[PDB]
Amino acid sequence: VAGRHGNKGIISKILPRQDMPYLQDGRSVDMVFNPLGVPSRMNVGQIFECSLGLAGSLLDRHYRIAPFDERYEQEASRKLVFSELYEASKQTANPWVFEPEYPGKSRIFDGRTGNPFEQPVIIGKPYILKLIHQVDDKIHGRSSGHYALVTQQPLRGRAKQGGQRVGEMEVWALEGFGVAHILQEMLTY
Amino acid sequence: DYLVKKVSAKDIQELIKGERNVPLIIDFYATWCGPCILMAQELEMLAVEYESNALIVKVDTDDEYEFARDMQVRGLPTLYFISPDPNKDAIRTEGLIPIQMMRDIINND
Amino acid sequence: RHLYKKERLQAEKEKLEKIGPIAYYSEWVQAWKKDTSREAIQKHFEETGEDENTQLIEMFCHQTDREYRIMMGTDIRIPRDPLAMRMREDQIKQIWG
Amino acid sequence: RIPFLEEQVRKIRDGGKLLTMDIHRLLLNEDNRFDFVNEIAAEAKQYVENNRDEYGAKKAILHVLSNRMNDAGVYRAEAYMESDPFKPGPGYLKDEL
Amino acid sequence: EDISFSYGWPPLVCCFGAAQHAFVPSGRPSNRLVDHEWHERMKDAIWDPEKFTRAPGGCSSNVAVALASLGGKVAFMGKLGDDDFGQSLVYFMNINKVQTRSVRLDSKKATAITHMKIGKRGGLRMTTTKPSAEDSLLKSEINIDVLKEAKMFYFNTFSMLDPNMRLTTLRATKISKKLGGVVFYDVNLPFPLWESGDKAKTFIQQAWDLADIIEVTKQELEFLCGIKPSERFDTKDNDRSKFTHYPPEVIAPLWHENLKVLFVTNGTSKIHYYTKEHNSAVLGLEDVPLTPYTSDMSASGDGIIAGIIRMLTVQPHLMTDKGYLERTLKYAISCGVVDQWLQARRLGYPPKEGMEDDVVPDDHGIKSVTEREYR
Amino acid sequence: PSLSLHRCGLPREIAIELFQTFVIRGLIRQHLASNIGVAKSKIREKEPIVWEILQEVMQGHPVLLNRAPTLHRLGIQAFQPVLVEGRAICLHPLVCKGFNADFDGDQMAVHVPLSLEAQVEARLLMFSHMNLLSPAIGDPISVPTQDMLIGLYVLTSGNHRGICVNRYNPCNRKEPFFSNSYDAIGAYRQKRINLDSPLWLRWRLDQRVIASRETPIEVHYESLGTFYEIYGHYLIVRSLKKQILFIYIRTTVGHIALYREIEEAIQGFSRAYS
Amino acid sequence: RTLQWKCVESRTDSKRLYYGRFILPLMKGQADTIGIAMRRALLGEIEGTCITRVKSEKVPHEYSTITGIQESVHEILMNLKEIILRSNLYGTSDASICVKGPGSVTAQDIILPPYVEIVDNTQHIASLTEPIDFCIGLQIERNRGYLIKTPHNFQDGSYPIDAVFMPVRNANHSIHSYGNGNEKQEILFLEIWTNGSLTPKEALHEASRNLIDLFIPFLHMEEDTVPLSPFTFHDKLAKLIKNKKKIALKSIFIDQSELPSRIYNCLKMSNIYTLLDLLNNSQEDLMKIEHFRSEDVKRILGILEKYFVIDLAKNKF
Amino acid sequence: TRTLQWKCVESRTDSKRLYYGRFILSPLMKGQADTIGIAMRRALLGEIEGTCITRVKSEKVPHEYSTITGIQESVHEILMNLKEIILRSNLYGTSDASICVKGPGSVTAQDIILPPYVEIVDNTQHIASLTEPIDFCIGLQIERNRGYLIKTPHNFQDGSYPIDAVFMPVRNANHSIHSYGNGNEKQEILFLEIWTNGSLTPKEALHEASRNLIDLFIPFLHMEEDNIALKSIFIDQSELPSRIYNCLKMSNIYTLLDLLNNSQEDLMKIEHFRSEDVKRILGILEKY
Amino acid sequence: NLVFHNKAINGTAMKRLISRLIDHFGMAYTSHILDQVKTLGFQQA
Ligand SMILES: [Mg+2]
Ligand SMILES: [Zn+2]
């Protein structure tokens, strides 16, 4: 799954709603992402997009913004996001949407124990997409099977029900270990 | 249908006077009591096992308070086992009692 | 920054103790228009038999959901700075300019 | 004795970490690892040649290793094989996430 | 004087009487606090007895099994059979940690069977042809040592029904009082004695006199005292006409110099206490899972009694404190509700229809999910 | 994350393919099928028994895993397979550096070692526990790396010391004292204290605390003969006979938690061997 | 009494959305335990009823289309997955729809059995724009959680839908201080949102009962062929005495083999309740129990031997 | 038949002060096990009640930091030694206890004089050691509370020093799950481990926690005895005299809906307003 | 027999410790220590 700012990941676990992290409104978050990714990958765009999404959902607005907004003024994007979050907080009376001490972040709780997590966290509704590369297409296995005409070796390809390659680099690694018997097997039987 | 049949107080009187050739078992019961609902089930089995070698009848205590006081009911789940030879005595059993015990009494008393 | 929030939070604890439970929580119920002094509460117990707790429960029955949601800053688990809660609109705007 | 180590000890035995510890003891008696691998392989072959049908869920390599440890004084089960005391019934599988 | 060496902290309590399996002394009309609206919505799947009748309580073995569960040290004194039933009954008690040293077993007598003479016209039976083992206990067999160690004695009116046994019981009570004991009397009036009030008061007056603590159901209190009920007894609302606290004066006719407390029970729904200087009540839950087998409400009775015993025994100095008594009463309401609930789960429900269930050698039962099946 | 170092999770569909011959034998040996053809049918209907047999067969049999650009030996390592439902292979968090793997689209390959000779070599020479040091200079290859490091840092980070903790000079005018480490860990759970709150712990052992070479801030000496020495992180109480009556350490709950885990693991491994 | 509960607010926003808020002086740690358990029970332990299979009479597949209906078969099936129903009984039940002509087929058009009842009455199943006949067959069930559509293989005309049987949409809780000074007491508030199959107050009660049923098992007797029988103790013993020697030994208790009281009391305290226990324990061990003499070991052995010949550990070497 | 059952699988008594038990529960439907475990662990670690020594009164001296006479140990060390003493009781209220020994050589341990209800779990625990003949007299106070560590410290009327009390009988608790699902359905097993201080057995603690939990959820079941066009109309349109209009607009009333929301008492707060005016507004509305 | 550390742990410090532990206790013990530290790190984070 991926977002529009260069962020990609593979799903690892699905958990029941009761065990998911939850907000001061009671609702449970749909996805949880690692936060150590942004410093390395340099995308601060996502933080601006998640926060604006939360506002629009609450106030019933969609926003279409053209690029390079700072031409008008310094820190233009911050002024848009922070202002909109405040309006949502006031109109629907949810004070957690804009918190004056740490704007954009809130305090959430754990589903398993009911206890508050210690430091404030970033919550938002971004837009996430599902990619064409799926597990079902990827999985393959083989035992026995059809063999090629001249080389008399196994066939290549999942469609063709084939084997996998032990190539030059792999031999070298097996040699480093000193596993002669294992290697001979791959080359003969 | 049920082999066990509810009977009025008066009718029971008639039975005591008249002759009998198979053992009568009388159960005093009440709608409210929980043990008695369980008891009814076990007596019913015995009816099948004896199969016309006995008569089993029931009287509801709440309707016939006086009849009961006379035959000395002490607590609700009570069974009186009576016999044809009118010199041999009666047996009163109080409380839920296992089936094998019920069986023995009919045979040996 | 922390030293100061703690000081403000301790003052709130003290006001609840002096004023009483019904008075502190009445900022957030605006439909209660009845005396909330400790001395007013005792008089009602003598006259009608309803103690402090019963009176507090009756007050909350007059609160709007919008107002309840604003009272969550008073939660023991995740308490909010008393200054942020009561700040005016003009002041907040200056965060973004 | 540290007071609460019970679970960790149950797990070490159950997990199969015991085998790892054993391999290490045994290699502390040998200059060439490569030769020890060859000696163990030979013993396993003798065992399977002599009684073929015992094996299949009991593995020969494990048997050779358990036998070494028991000879030297540490009680190990045969072939490091442990039953599941609490399985619900036949045809039931544990989910070892 | 082996006391120092062997007595132990939880003081021993001794329950005297008859051991029986599932015996109900009596049953009278009653009312309960329930949510009437839920009952309408769940009419299809909940058993609600049509006319509600509540048993006073159960046999003394039942009170003892209950104390043991809560943690008390308990002993049962009485006589039983060495016939199979008897030996099995002793096993139950033993498995449930009730000391059985005081019980005595006899070869000739039988466990629940009383041979009776056919009697005069009108079927008036005579029960003296042969007494049953339970009511056949003699003064010689009473175990003095158990009586000596114990700081509480519990007895019921059932053991006062047979003529010889009455005598034995009164002796046990008097022996205990001297040695040092608090006597707890539970009037759980059986079926015969409901004919008239005057007769009842006279039958039990000697026992009433010898007791430090007494427990009476509300319906019994009215019967002894005189009041005739004026409550609907079959309606869909909780109205306060029921659940009345009789004023202290109505109760005062029955006091004696040695009576420390009187407990009047309306079920787990309300429990009332009367002491010489104070009077009060505590309230509870009676809307509990009920099955046809458990509708009598006997189990709650035994549980309530057990809680009152445990608490009074552990801190003896405060039987008359206003606060302790209120805390005791709340623990009792809780023990009662737990017991009625547990029973329903254990015993189960009778098969509704489509009774093709496997049958135990004596009877058949199903779980709640099963009861609630579509047709 | 929950897997141990010696284990890997293999999807069941992949396994049935790789271990088929072994399962057929089992079906026949247990006489749950008459012929090889008979068994292959049972495998297809996915009958529940096929699964009990599969589990039995793979219990002591290792498997080999490799990533595509196999730059160095650590590219291939061996694990004990654990059946999992789902279609992806689960890998331990700490083996990813060697394989140079991340969880954004990377794929891996599995091979099964058929001969006895081959099987011995894999358990004895190609498992992670045996290969914890890299070939080039001798450095550790499996060390806590990202989130795990964040957690360790937080536990040992510490507490505010002066202006940050007190507004006004302490002159004009922490408290908890605990006797055993267990109690302290307990208070954290019961919310009596926080992770960073300072505390005093009695130490019965021998001055192992890494601290600077600093002389005492104040020595307080009394007439009957006892002297109390206050250093920054410790208080040593001594008597006329020159014996150390007590030592107390100033610390935080987080520090005691890391020590305890390292210590308990050592003792646990020892008690298991026996 | 001291603890009191009430419903502070109740609202019905739509026929399919309901709301409720409740209030509860509680001691210092009690509120958190009550709140977490209630959330987990409300979102997780309450069951509901839903349509599980549909029989469309003459369609090749679900991705087809039919004339006179603006939606495909897949769309009609999705719309059905959203219908709200109320029932208290288990098992499968059958119902049908048979409207004709131009118009809209809505929830009212379903004919139901006696036990199941619809809630909304306005939910839309399909849009019909020609004079056509719509006939469908439906199956309804009560269960918990969610169902994967496992039986892809099906009888002709039958297609399954993944039902979600959860009747509570959302929940929240909050804890505040009662300001009682030294005694720290607290006030709890809970809020519940429901689909309207059941009221929030009913959900609150159902959750409490379900929780007690999960903690009550512990207070039954420990497990050590049919349950739910009054005579489980009797039948068990009948086998225990008949079946095995050394197991009959469990039946015998120290109480029956009469002993003098001083000895009996001491033995019981030291965890000895049965004979197999006494025989197992060493003679030396008896000296270990406090206030146990030399005369007593003799007494016990003398009474025991009369009762039975065996000395399992009773006999010293 | 699908009936939940509980068994004890492991038990061990290491010292008189440490006990361990492991328990199991029968198959549970998915999702059930974790809820049951979390709650139990909370009850065991916080709801069970314990008895311990809250306050100590040493009559011999008033010095805050002075070793007195024979005793080999400090005042503070004795206070620590006293806090580590385990007791079992069923008290309602408070009680007093004392220790008095006159020993040339002393191993003060188990000399506490207690009321019959209170009991001592381990006799050997060492309160103190006296090197020279002297008379030692200490008075103590004992209480029963559910692990609530403290109240505000009270006044030191005499040389009476408070002791910080941990009232927790159970030392640790943990839970685990195994899921054995095959074919049609999944079943789970809960495993609970309890360690105790010897005041109660682990099995007893298990039962107590279950009872404590049930009483917490019983209160919910208790039953008591029984005895917009306006939005779009603005004040400008309904003719109103100027002084009243300016005043209302001052206080943020802009539309009719809003005047209705306001009440007669509320109006008298805005300044420059008059009671007669309240009548006039009523008259204007009256015409509608 | 280990040192008590009263200052922060950063990545350099963990590599030094794992190295030091491998030399003193060996690879088997170190593997168990490593799995346990991982659990603690994930939990606190
Ligand atoms: Mg990648
Ligand atoms: Zn910008």
Curated annotation (Swiss-Prot), chain A:
It is found in: Plastid, Chloroplast. It comes from the Eukaryota. DNA-dependent RNA polymerase catalyzes the transcription of DNA into RNA using the four ribonucleoside triphosphates as substrates. In plastids the minimal PEP RNA polymerase catalytic core is composed of four subunits: alpha, beta, beta', and beta''. When a (nuclear-encoded) sigma factor is associated with the core the holoenzyme is formed, which can initiate transcription. Belongs to the RNA polymerase beta chain family. This is DNA-directed RNA polymerase subunit beta. It comes from Nicotiana tabacum. The chain holds residues 820 to 1008 of 1070 of the full protein.
From Swiss-Prot, chain H:
It is found in: Plastid, Chloroplast. Pfam families: RNA_pol_A_bac (PF01000), RNA_pol_A_CTD (PF03118), RNA_pol_L (PF01193). This is DNA-directed RNA polymerase subunit alpha. Residues 1-224 are annotated as: Alpha N-terminal domain (alpha-NTD). Keywords: Chloroplast, DNA-directed RNA polymerase, Nucleotidyltransferase, Plastid, Transcription, Transferase. The keyword Ribosomal protein does not apply. It comes from Nicotiana tabacum (Common tobacco). GO terms for molecular function: DNA binding; DNA-directed RNA polymerase activity; protein dimerization activity. One of its GO terms (biological process) is DNA-templated transcription. In plastids the minimal PEP RNA polymerase catalytic core is composed of four subunits: alpha, beta, beta', and beta''. When a (nuclear-encoded) sigma factor is associated with the core the holoenzyme is formed, which can initiate transcription. Its EC number is 2.7.7.6. DNA-dependent RNA polymerase catalyzes the transcription of DNA into RNA using the four ribonucleoside triphosphates as substrates.
Swiss-Prot record, chain I:
DNA-dependent RNA polymerase catalyzes the transcription of DNA into RNA using the four ribonucleoside triphosphates as substrates. It comes from the Eukaryota. This is DNA-directed RNA polymerase subunit beta''. The gene is rpoC2. It is found in: Plastid, Chloroplast. The lineage of its organism: Eukaryota, Viridiplantae, Streptophyta, Embryophyta, Tracheophyta. In plastids the minimal PEP RNA polymerase catalytic core is composed of four subunits: alpha, beta, beta', and beta''. When a (nuclear-encoded) sigma factor is associated with the core the holoenzyme is formed, which can initiate transcription. Belongs to the RNA polymerase beta' chain family. RpoC2 subfamily. It comes from Nicotiana tabacum. The chain holds residues 10 to 54 of 1392 of the full protein.
